Amino acid sequence: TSRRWFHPNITGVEAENLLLTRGVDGSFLARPSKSNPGDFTLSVRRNGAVTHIKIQNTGGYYDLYGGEKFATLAELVQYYMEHHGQLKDVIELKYPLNCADPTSERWFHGHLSGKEAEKLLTEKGKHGSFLVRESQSHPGDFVLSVRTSNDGKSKVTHVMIRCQELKYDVGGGERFDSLTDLVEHYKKNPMVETLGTVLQLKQPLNTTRINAAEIESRVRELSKQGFWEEFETLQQQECKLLYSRKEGQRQENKNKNRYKNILPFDHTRVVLHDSDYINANIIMPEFKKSYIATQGCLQNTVNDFWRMVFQENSRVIVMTTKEVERGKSKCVKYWPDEYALKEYGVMRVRNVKESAAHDYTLRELKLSKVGQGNTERTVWQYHFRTWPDHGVPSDPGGVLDFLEEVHHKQESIMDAGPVVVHCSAGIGRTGTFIVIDILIDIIREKGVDCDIDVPKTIQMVRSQRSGMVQTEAQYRFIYMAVQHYIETLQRRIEEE
């Protein structure tokens, strides 16, 4: 279940040519926009002509022009192929035109020497750890290095991959049209050595896990792009997370979603104890603070939101957007005015005090159940207001100082439930805040000598809610926030 319809290194022209020379009517491909960085293009072939459809991502979701809104490109493609439709009057999405480029695959390392691959497999790798690198002695050819410390019970085996007439082979048998086709076949049908050893391609070698103290070196390496390559490699793994979202698709729940196709996964969704539906998922860091990643309140979901906050015993709400951003509502006001008391169905909310800071507004709320003896608990709502209208903040200090306060508030309340985090779709900005908070919590407790892995943490969060962390700008910001936090901690060590 690998993502093949995405072509990362082609121009609009090359897309038009590929679909007219290799494809037919119904053939399609997705590619990054060369003209609009961060955006994407859906190139579909129809009636002997190629139509380019714009896919915008402002940081909250994927917006298909003339189409609908989605959490990932894989969920967009799955929707129009399993099988729905779009206008500009139909555009048929029938045949995914496969990409032969291996650059964005986890196992591919490109220009890497034999000695480098050997040391990396002996130190980082274990049983079934594999990689594909370019051959220095044989230009055009590739080398597959597989692992199956002085005992000699483990070994590194090298398999030659010949590239002949745009096709790849292991010196015999089948000739594959792409390096990915070769890997998928031998991952399924492992190569057997003449003496019995099975060359199992279990997992690719991890090249993203770094020690927290060496962040400055990794940031410098990714800046001169590295950040783009790492993010595009992370996007190639989204086809593995197409979990069922049946509850969100139900007719009785359709209007409970801000965006029709941005739904919670069934296995992680928040189930309301007596309707059990809310577009929210429990985010549990897996490698102990937990989170609720949710959409901005709808007028008809305000009562359900408070039902969720009450039942989960949540004491901290992180609001990442303003009520209206760029002329479109991101969240409905679900809290009463300062000093006022309001009833939201069975729930009662008192806005005790509003405290304004530079980057945020803090609202001390008192949540209770109507007609029920001491159900009252203080809910601290942290409203972040300085996130720019376009892109990410230029300085990570604001977000970090805010999350440090949010963390300390959460820790000060014994048996406090998951931290509620929300933005527009509850995926982009929400995903960014949650990932940063998870990463800084590892460093805060375990120290600067603990290992961190930015894309692996994101993938783990993405398996719990669709498309958590939307853009490359947000991905780069996570690295900038972690680096700033470490720099701050090292300055503390120096000054006391």
- CATH, residue 323: 3.90.190.10
Q: Tell me: do 338 and 449 sit in the same domain.
A: yes
Does 394 carry a binding-site annotation? no
In whole angstroms, what separates CA 176 from the centre of its chain? 31
Resolution rounded to one decimal, in angstroms: 2.2
> For residues 298 and 334, is the Cβ–Cβ distance under 8 A?
no
Q: Tell me: do 278 and 144 sit in the same domain.
A: no
> For residues 256 and 303, is the Cβ–Cβ distance under 8 A?
no
Q: Tell me: do 195 and 110 sit in the same domain.
A: yes
Instruction: Report residue 60: phi and psi, to 5°.
Output: -110, -30
> For residues 236 and 483, is the Cβ–Cβ distance under 8 A?
no
The pair of structure tokens assigned to 85 is 């439709």
Does 450 carry a binding-site annotation? no
Does 26 carry a binding-site annotation? no
Q: Tell me: do 197 and 221 sit in the same domain.
A: no
Does 389 carry a binding-site annotation? yes
Which residues, 6+ apart, have CB-to-CB distance to 301 below 8 Å?
Answer: 256, 278, 279
Which residues, 6+ apart, have CB-to-CB distance to 441 below 8 Å?
Answer: 285, 289, 407
Q: Which of 99, 297, 331, 423 is catalytic?
A: 423
Q: Tell me: do 439 and 489 sit in the same domain.
A: yes
> For residues 237 and 106, is the Cβ–Cβ distance under 8 A?
yes
> Which of 58, 81, 104 is a domain's end point?
104
Q: Tell me: do 80 and 200 sit in the same domain.
A: no
Q: How many domains does the chain have?
A: 3
Amino acid, single-letter form, for residue 363: R
Q: Tell me: do 99 and 117 sit in the same domain.
A: no
CA-CA distances (angstroms) from residue 218 to 21, 82, 235, 367, 447? 41, 41, 20, 45, 18
Does 425 carry a binding-site annotation? yes
Q: Which residue has the tokens 């933005």?
A: 423
C-alpha 264/C-alpha 270 separation (Å) is 9
What is the pairing mode between strands 62-64 and 69-70?
antiparallel
Cα R_g (the chain), whole angstroms = 25
Instruction: Report residue 141: phi and psi, to 5°.
Output: -80, 165
Q: Tell me: do 126 and 216 sit in the same domain.
A: no
> For residues 335 and 317, is the Cβ–Cβ distance under 8 A?
no
Q: Tell me: do 262 and 335 sit in the same domain.
A: yes
Q: Tell me: do 364 and 448 sit in the same domain.
A: yes
Q: Any idea what the CATH number is for the domain that residue 8 is in?
A: 3.30.505.10
CA-CA distances (angstroms) from residue 369 to 106, 221, 366, 419? 50, 54, 10, 20
Which residues, 6+ apart, have CB-to-CB distance to 376 below 8 Å?
Answer: 366, 367, 368
Q: Tell me: do 43 and 83 sit in the same domain.
A: yes
Nearest Cα residue to 269 out of 235, 295, 238, 289? 295
Nearest Cα residue to 295 out of 384, 427, 425, 432? 425
Query: Is 163 assigned a catalytic role?
Result: no
> Which of 166, 186, 204 is a domain's end point?
204
Other beta carbons within 10 angstroms of residue 448's beta carbon come to: 17
Does 27 carry a binding-site annotation? no
Nearest Cα residue to 424 out of 69, 2, 32, 36? 69
Strand partners, 30: 6, 42
CA-CA distances (angstroms) from residue 393 to 220, 359, 473, 474? 19, 11, 10, 9
Q: What's the chain look like in SS3?
A: CCCCCECCCCCHHHHHHHHHHCCCCCEEEEEECCCCCCCEEEEEEECCEEEEEEEECCCCCEEECCCCEECCHHHHHHHCCCCCCCECCECCCCEECCCCCCCCCCCEEECCCHHHHHHHHHHCCCCCEEEEEECCCCCCCEEEEEECCCCCCCCEEEEEEEEECCEEECCCCCCECCHHHHHHHHHHCCEECCCCCEECCCEECCCCCEEHHHHHHHHHHHHCCHHHHHHHHHHCCHHHHCCCCHHHHCHHHHHHCCCCCCCCCCCCECCCCCCCCCCEEEECCCCCCCEEEECCCCCCCHHHHHHHHHHCCCCEEEECCCCEECCEECCCCCCCCCCCEEEECCEEEEEEEEEECCCEEEEEEEEEECCCCCCCEEEEEEEECCCCCCCCCCCCHHHHHHHHHHHHHHHCCCCCCCEEEECCCCCCHHHHHHHHHHHHHHHHHHCCCCEECHHHHHHHHHCCCCCCCCCHHHHHHHHHHHHHHHHHHHHHHHCC
The pair of structure tokens assigned to 81 is 């192929």
Q: Which residue has the tokens 């990794």?
A: 218
Q: Tell me: do 227 and 356 sit in the same domain.
A: yes
> Which of 39, 69, 104 is a domain's end point?
104
Domain assignment of residue 170, given as a range: 105-204
Nearest Cα residue to 106 out of 122, 88, 129, 83? 129
The pair of structure tokens assigned to 147 is 């692992």
Instruction: Report residue 413: phi and psi, to 5°.
Output: -110, 110
Does 470 carry a binding-site annotation? yes
The gap between the terminal CA atoms of the chain, to the nearest Å, is 53
